Amino acid sequence: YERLKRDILALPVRERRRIKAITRESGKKGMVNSVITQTRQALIPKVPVVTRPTNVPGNSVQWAQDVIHGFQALLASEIYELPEMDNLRTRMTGISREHGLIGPVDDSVIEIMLIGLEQHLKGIVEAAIDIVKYRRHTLTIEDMYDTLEQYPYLVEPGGTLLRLQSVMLHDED
Amino acid sequence: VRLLHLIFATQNIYSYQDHVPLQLMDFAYRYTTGTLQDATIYSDHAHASNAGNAGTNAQLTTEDIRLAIAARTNYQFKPVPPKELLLELAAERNKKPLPAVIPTWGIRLPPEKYCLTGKDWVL
Amino acid sequence: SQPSLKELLRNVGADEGDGETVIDGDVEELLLDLADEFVTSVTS
Protein backbone atom coordinates (compact mmCIF):
# COMPACT_ATOMS: atom_id res chain seq x y z
CA TYR A 1 0.00 0.00 0.00
CA GLU A 2 2.84 2.37 0.86
CA ARG A 3 4.54 2.07 -2.53
CA LEU A 4 1.21 2.23 -4.35
CA LYS A 5 0.24 5.17 -2.14
CA ARG A 6 3.38 7.11 -3.08
CA ASP A 7 2.84 6.24 -6.74
CA ILE A 8 -0.73 7.56 -6.60
CA LEU A 9 0.55 10.67 -4.82
CA ALA A 10 2.91 11.08 -7.77
CA LEU A 11 -0.13 10.66 -10.04
CA PRO A 12 -1.07 14.13 -8.79
CA VAL A 13 1.04 16.97 -10.14
CA ARG A 14 1.83 17.95 -6.53
CA GLU A 15 4.64 15.37 -6.50
CA ARG A 16 6.92 18.34 -7.19
CA ARG A 17 5.63 20.21 -4.14
CA ARG A 18 5.99 17.02 -2.10
CA ILE A 19 9.59 16.71 -3.30
CA LYS A 20 10.53 20.23 -2.15
CA ALA A 21 9.45 19.85 1.50
CA ILE A 22 12.61 18.08 2.64
CA THR A 23 14.34 20.94 4.49
CA ARG A 24 13.74 22.26 7.99
CA GLU A 25 11.28 25.13 7.87
CA SER A 26 10.94 28.24 10.04
CA GLY A 27 13.63 30.04 8.09
CA LYS A 28 14.14 32.56 10.88
CA LYS A 29 16.51 33.18 13.76
CA GLY A 30 14.51 30.34 15.30
CA MET A 31 11.28 28.98 16.68
CA VAL A 32 12.21 26.74 19.60
CA ASN A 33 9.72 23.96 20.39
CA SER A 34 11.15 22.74 23.70
CA VAL A 35 9.47 23.10 27.09
CA ILE A 36 11.92 24.36 29.70
CA THR A 37 13.03 27.38 27.69
CA GLN A 38 9.42 28.30 26.95
CA THR A 39 8.85 28.15 30.70
CA ARG A 40 11.88 30.16 31.80
CA GLN A 41 11.49 32.73 29.04
CA ALA A 42 7.83 32.88 30.14
CA LEU A 43 8.87 33.34 33.79
CA ILE A 44 11.59 35.99 34.03
CA PRO A 45 10.52 39.61 33.62
CA LYS A 46 11.36 41.16 30.29
CA VAL A 47 12.43 44.73 29.60
CA PRO A 48 11.30 46.84 26.61
CA VAL A 49 14.70 48.50 25.96
CA VAL A 50 14.80 50.31 22.65
CA THR A 51 17.17 51.04 19.80
CA ARG A 52 17.76 54.45 18.23
CA PRO A 53 19.05 54.11 14.64
CA THR A 54 17.75 57.50 13.50
CA ASN A 55 14.79 58.28 15.80
CA VAL A 56 12.48 56.06 17.85
CA PRO A 57 9.68 58.41 19.02
CA GLY A 58 7.54 58.13 22.14
CA ASN A 59 8.95 61.05 24.14
CA SER A 60 9.08 58.90 27.29
CA VAL A 61 12.06 56.64 27.94
CA GLN A 62 11.43 52.97 28.66
CA TRP A 63 11.93 51.71 32.21
CA ALA A 64 11.97 48.37 33.99
CA GLN A 65 11.71 49.87 37.47
CA ASP A 66 8.00 49.54 36.63
CA VAL A 67 8.18 45.72 36.16
CA ILE A 68 9.77 45.17 39.62
CA HIS A 69 7.18 47.47 41.19
CA GLY A 70 4.39 45.50 39.45
CA PHE A 71 5.60 42.07 40.67
CA GLN A 72 5.94 43.45 44.25
CA ALA A 73 2.24 44.45 44.83
CA LEU A 74 0.06 42.96 47.52
CA LEU A 75 -2.12 41.34 44.87
CA ALA A 76 -5.47 39.72 45.62
CA SER A 77 -5.99 36.48 47.56
CA GLU A 78 -3.75 37.67 50.42
CA ILE A 79 -6.06 40.57 51.32
CA TYR A 80 -9.79 39.72 51.58
CA GLU A 81 -11.21 42.22 49.06
CA LEU A 82 -11.23 42.78 45.27
CA PRO A 83 -8.42 45.28 44.40
CA GLU A 84 -9.19 49.06 44.37
CA MET A 85 -7.93 51.00 41.27
CA ASP A 86 -4.43 51.92 42.46
CA ASN A 87 -3.16 48.33 43.03
CA LEU A 88 -4.54 47.23 39.62
CA ARG A 89 -2.90 50.22 37.86
CA THR A 90 0.48 49.44 39.48
CA ARG A 91 0.21 45.80 38.33
CA MET A 92 -0.77 46.76 34.73
CA THR A 93 2.11 49.18 33.94
CA GLY A 94 4.33 46.25 34.89
CA ILE A 95 2.66 43.92 32.42
CA SER A 96 2.62 46.47 29.60
CA ARG A 97 6.32 47.26 29.93
CA GLU A 98 6.96 43.53 30.40
CA HIS A 99 5.28 42.69 27.09
CA GLY A 100 6.95 45.47 25.09
CA LEU A 101 4.71 48.53 25.14
CA ILE A 102 5.27 52.03 26.51
CA GLY A 103 3.17 54.91 27.75
CA PRO A 104 1.06 55.12 30.90
CA VAL A 105 -2.32 53.51 31.39
CA ASP A 106 -4.92 56.25 31.26
CA ASP A 107 -7.17 55.70 34.28
CA SER A 108 -10.27 54.55 32.35
CA VAL A 109 -8.92 51.04 31.71
CA ILE A 110 -8.91 50.13 35.40
CA GLU A 111 -12.58 50.98 35.86
CA ILE A 112 -13.96 49.05 32.89
CA MET A 113 -11.82 46.15 34.07
CA LEU A 114 -13.28 46.24 37.60
CA ILE A 115 -16.71 46.34 35.99
CA GLY A 116 -16.14 43.20 33.94
CA LEU A 117 -14.63 41.51 36.98
CA GLU A 118 -17.55 42.03 39.34
CA GLN A 119 -19.91 40.93 36.56
CA HIS A 120 -17.91 37.70 36.25
CA LEU A 121 -18.06 36.92 39.94
CA LYS A 122 -21.74 37.70 40.27
CA GLY A 123 -22.33 35.15 37.51
CA ILE A 124 -20.33 32.47 39.30
CA VAL A 125 -21.96 32.94 42.69
CA GLU A 126 -25.40 33.04 41.09
CA ALA A 127 -24.58 29.62 39.67
CA ALA A 128 -23.63 28.21 43.06
CA ILE A 129 -26.77 29.63 44.65
CA ASP A 130 -28.74 27.94 41.89
CA ILE A 131 -27.06 24.70 42.95
CA VAL A 132 -27.58 24.67 46.70
CA LYS A 133 -31.22 25.71 47.16
CA TYR A 134 -34.08 25.08 44.76
CA ARG A 135 -36.48 27.87 45.65
CA ARG A 136 -31.66 29.55 56.17
CA HIS A 137 -28.68 28.01 54.37
CA THR A 138 -24.94 28.60 54.13
CA LEU A 139 -22.53 27.76 51.37
CA THR A 140 -19.33 25.69 51.27
CA ILE A 141 -16.38 24.86 49.01
CA GLU A 142 -17.84 21.60 47.69
CA ASP A 143 -20.82 23.37 46.12
CA MET A 144 -18.45 25.58 44.17
CA TYR A 145 -16.47 22.57 43.03
CA ASP A 146 -19.73 20.95 41.96
CA THR A 147 -20.72 23.97 39.90
CA LEU A 148 -17.23 24.21 38.38
CA GLU A 149 -17.63 20.60 37.38
CA GLN A 150 -20.98 21.36 35.75
CA TYR A 151 -20.11 24.75 34.24
CA PRO A 152 -16.37 24.90 33.44
CA TYR A 153 -16.84 27.24 30.48
CA LEU A 154 -16.93 30.05 33.04
CA VAL A 155 -13.33 29.87 34.19
CA GLU A 156 -10.32 29.47 31.96
CA PRO A 157 -8.41 26.31 32.92
CA GLY A 158 -4.98 26.52 34.48
CA GLY A 159 -3.55 27.81 37.71
CA THR A 160 -6.63 27.76 39.91
CA LEU A 161 -8.53 24.55 39.14
CA LEU A 162 -5.45 22.50 39.88
CA ARG A 163 -5.12 24.60 43.02
CA LEU A 164 -8.81 23.91 43.67
CA GLN A 165 -8.20 20.17 43.64
CA SER A 166 -5.45 20.67 46.26
CA VAL A 167 -7.49 22.56 48.90
CA MET A 168 -10.30 20.01 49.42
CA LEU A 169 -9.12 18.95 52.83
CA HIS A 170 -10.87 16.38 55.00
CA ASP A 171 -12.59 17.24 58.28
CA GLU A 172 -9.99 16.29 60.88
CA ASP A 173 -6.50 17.61 60.19
CA VAL B 1 -7.62 12.45 0.99
CA ARG B 2 -4.64 10.26 0.15
CA LEU B 3 -2.26 12.78 1.72
CA LEU B 4 -4.06 12.25 5.01
CA HIS B 5 -3.13 8.57 4.77
CA LEU B 6 0.40 9.75 4.01
CA ILE B 7 0.33 11.77 7.22
CA PHE B 8 -1.05 8.81 9.15
CA ALA B 9 2.03 6.93 8.00
CA THR B 10 4.22 9.14 10.20
CA GLN B 11 2.88 7.66 13.47
CA ASN B 12 2.64 3.93 12.60
CA ILE B 13 -1.17 3.78 12.64
CA TYR B 14 -2.05 2.00 9.39
CA SER B 15 -5.38 0.67 10.72
CA TYR B 16 -7.84 3.51 10.09
CA GLN B 17 -11.60 3.26 9.58
CA ASP B 18 -11.89 5.80 6.71
CA HIS B 19 -14.24 8.13 8.59
CA VAL B 20 -11.30 9.77 10.38
CA PRO B 21 -9.94 11.65 7.32
CA LEU B 22 -13.30 13.20 6.50
CA GLN B 23 -13.69 14.14 10.14
CA LEU B 24 -10.26 15.65 10.79
CA MET B 25 -10.37 17.58 7.50
CA ASP B 26 -13.82 18.94 8.39
CA PHE B 27 -12.30 19.89 11.73
CA ALA B 28 -9.33 21.75 10.31
CA TYR B 29 -11.63 23.63 7.95
CA ARG B 30 -13.84 24.75 10.84
CA TYR B 31 -10.82 25.71 12.93
CA THR B 32 -9.04 27.77 10.28
CA THR B 33 -12.29 29.48 9.29
CA GLY B 34 -12.70 30.76 12.83
CA THR B 35 -9.01 31.65 13.03
CA LEU B 36 -8.69 33.76 9.88
CA GLN B 37 -12.11 35.25 10.68
CA ASP B 38 -11.14 36.82 13.98
CA ALA B 39 -7.74 37.72 12.50
CA THR B 40 -9.64 39.69 9.87
CA ILE B 41 -11.47 41.44 12.71
CA TYR B 42 -8.12 42.44 14.17
CA SER B 43 -6.87 43.67 10.79
CA ASP B 44 -9.96 45.88 10.78
CA HIS B 45 -9.09 47.00 14.30
CA ALA B 46 -5.71 48.32 13.18
CA HIS B 47 -7.56 50.17 10.37
CA ALA B 48 -9.05 52.97 12.46
CA SER B 49 -15.72 48.90 13.25
CA ASN B 50 -18.41 51.39 14.31
CA ALA B 51 -21.61 52.40 12.47
CA GLY B 52 -19.72 54.04 9.62
CA ASN B 53 -16.29 55.59 10.10
CA ALA B 54 -14.00 54.26 7.33
CA GLY B 55 -13.46 51.37 4.92
CA THR B 56 -12.45 47.73 5.30
CA ASN B 57 -9.45 46.59 3.24
CA ALA B 58 -7.74 43.25 3.78
CA GLN B 59 -4.04 42.36 4.06
CA LEU B 60 -3.94 39.69 6.81
CA THR B 61 -0.28 39.50 7.74
CA THR B 62 1.04 36.75 10.01
CA GLU B 63 0.84 38.80 13.22
CA ASP B 64 -2.96 38.92 13.06
CA ILE B 65 -3.13 35.16 12.62
CA ARG B 66 -0.81 34.79 15.60
CA LEU B 67 -3.20 36.92 17.64
CA ALA B 68 -6.26 34.96 16.51
CA ILE B 69 -4.57 31.69 17.46
CA ALA B 70 -3.20 32.74 20.85
CA ALA B 71 -6.72 33.64 21.96
CA ARG B 72 -7.95 30.18 21.03
CA THR B 73 -5.15 28.41 22.85
CA ASN B 74 -5.91 30.68 25.80
CA TYR B 75 -8.76 28.21 26.53
CA GLN B 76 -8.00 25.14 24.39
CA PHE B 77 -5.22 22.97 23.00
CA LYS B 78 -3.45 21.14 25.86
CA PRO B 79 -0.35 23.28 26.44
CA VAL B 80 3.27 22.51 27.33
CA PRO B 81 3.53 20.29 30.45
CA PRO B 82 3.00 22.72 33.33
CA LYS B 83 5.48 20.94 35.55
CA GLU B 84 6.52 23.69 37.95
CA LEU B 85 2.96 24.58 38.90
CA LEU B 86 2.29 20.92 39.67
CA LEU B 87 5.52 20.49 41.63
CA GLU B 88 4.81 23.38 43.96
CA LEU B 89 1.12 22.54 44.23
CA ALA B 90 1.93 18.94 45.09
CA ALA B 91 4.53 20.02 47.64
CA GLU B 92 1.72 21.98 49.24
CA ARG B 93 -0.32 18.78 49.36
CA ASN B 94 2.73 16.64 50.16
CA LYS B 95 3.17 18.51 53.44
CA LYS B 96 0.79 17.17 56.08
CA PRO B 97 1.44 13.78 57.59
CA LEU B 98 -0.11 10.42 56.97
CA PRO B 99 -2.73 9.27 59.49
CA ALA B 100 -0.31 6.73 61.00
CA VAL B 101 -3.08 4.45 62.29
CA ILE B 102 -4.07 0.78 62.34
CA PRO B 103 -7.57 -0.31 61.24
CA THR B 104 -6.49 -3.84 62.24
CA TRP B 105 -6.93 -6.06 59.21
CA GLY B 106 -10.06 -5.07 57.35
CA ILE B 107 -11.11 -2.06 55.37
CA ARG B 108 -11.57 1.33 56.99
CA LEU B 109 -14.41 3.19 55.33
CA PRO B 110 -15.37 6.83 55.54
CA PRO B 111 -18.05 7.48 58.13
CA GLU B 112 -21.63 6.96 57.12
CA LYS B 113 -23.00 10.31 55.97
CA TYR B 114 -19.95 10.29 53.69
CA CYS B 115 -20.57 6.74 52.50
CA LEU B 116 -23.19 6.18 49.88
CA THR B 117 -25.34 3.20 50.93
CA GLY B 118 -26.33 2.42 47.39
CA LYS B 119 -29.96 1.60 48.07
CA ASP B 120 -32.73 1.80 45.51
CA TRP B 121 -33.23 5.54 45.06
CA VAL B 122 -36.70 6.52 46.21
CA LEU B 123 -38.85 9.51 47.18
CA SER C 1 -4.86 66.41 47.76
CA GLN C 2 -8.03 64.77 49.00
CA PRO C 3 -9.39 64.30 52.55
CA SER C 4 -8.73 60.65 53.31
CA LEU C 5 -13.33 46.27 52.25
CA LYS C 6 -17.03 46.90 51.52
CA GLU C 7 -16.80 45.75 47.91
CA LEU C 8 -17.08 41.97 48.13
CA LEU C 9 -19.49 42.17 51.06
CA ARG C 10 -21.55 44.43 48.81
CA ASN C 11 -21.04 42.04 45.88
CA VAL C 12 -22.69 39.31 47.98
CA GLY C 13 -25.13 41.10 50.28
CA ALA C 14 -27.02 42.18 47.16
CA ASP C 15 -27.25 38.69 45.62
CA GLU C 16 -29.62 37.12 48.16
CA GLY C 17 -31.78 37.78 51.20
CA ASP C 18 -31.87 34.36 52.95
CA GLY C 19 -28.43 34.50 54.51
CA GLU C 20 -26.21 32.41 52.24
CA THR C 21 -23.15 33.76 54.01
CA VAL C 22 -19.97 32.40 52.46
CA ILE C 23 -16.94 31.25 54.45
CA ASP C 24 -13.39 32.54 54.28
CA GLY C 25 -10.47 30.13 54.25
CA ASP C 26 -12.43 27.87 51.89
CA VAL C 27 -14.58 29.86 49.45
CA GLU C 28 -13.52 33.52 49.49
CA GLU C 29 -9.90 32.71 48.65
CA LEU C 30 -11.01 30.83 45.54
CA LEU C 31 -12.86 33.90 44.29
CA LEU C 32 -10.01 36.32 44.93
CA ASP C 33 -7.66 34.01 43.03
CA LEU C 34 -10.08 33.80 40.10
CA ALA C 35 -10.27 37.58 39.96
CA ASP C 36 -6.47 37.85 39.93
CA GLU C 37 -6.18 35.36 37.07
CA PHE C 38 -8.87 37.22 35.14
CA VAL C 39 -7.11 40.58 35.36
CA THR C 40 -3.71 39.14 34.46
CA SER C 41 -4.94 37.29 31.37
CA VAL C 42 -7.07 40.17 30.13
CA THR C 43 -4.43 42.88 30.39
CA SER C 44 -1.87 40.57 28.76
Partner: peptide, 26 residues
Protein backbone atom coordinates in the same frame (compact mmCIF):
# COMPACT_ATOMS: atom_id res chain seq x y z
CA UNK D 1 9.68 6.84 -5.50
CA UNK D 2 11.71 6.46 -2.24
CA UNK D 3 12.92 10.04 -2.81
CA UNK D 4 9.54 11.23 -1.49
CA UNK D 5 9.78 9.02 1.59
CA UNK D 6 13.17 10.55 2.30
CA UNK D 7 11.75 14.03 1.71
CA UNK D 8 8.69 13.60 3.92
CA UNK D 9 10.43 14.78 7.10
CA UNK D 10 8.46 17.96 7.63
CA UNK D 11 8.51 18.37 11.42
CA UNK D 12 5.64 20.87 11.52
CA UNK D 13 5.33 23.47 14.25
CA UNK D 14 2.64 25.66 15.80
CA UNK D 15 2.74 29.44 15.90
CA UNK D 16 2.15 30.05 19.62
CA UNK D 17 1.94 27.89 22.73
CA UNK D 18 0.35 28.71 26.05
CA UNK D 19 2.21 28.26 29.32
CA UNK D 20 0.13 27.68 32.44
CA UNK D 21 1.78 30.06 34.88
CA UNK D 22 -0.35 31.96 37.42
CA UNK D 23 0.53 35.27 38.97
CA UNK D 24 1.02 33.98 42.50
CA UNK D 25 3.73 31.38 41.87
CA UNK D 26 5.91 33.57 39.68
Amino acid sequence: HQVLDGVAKSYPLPLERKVIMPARSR
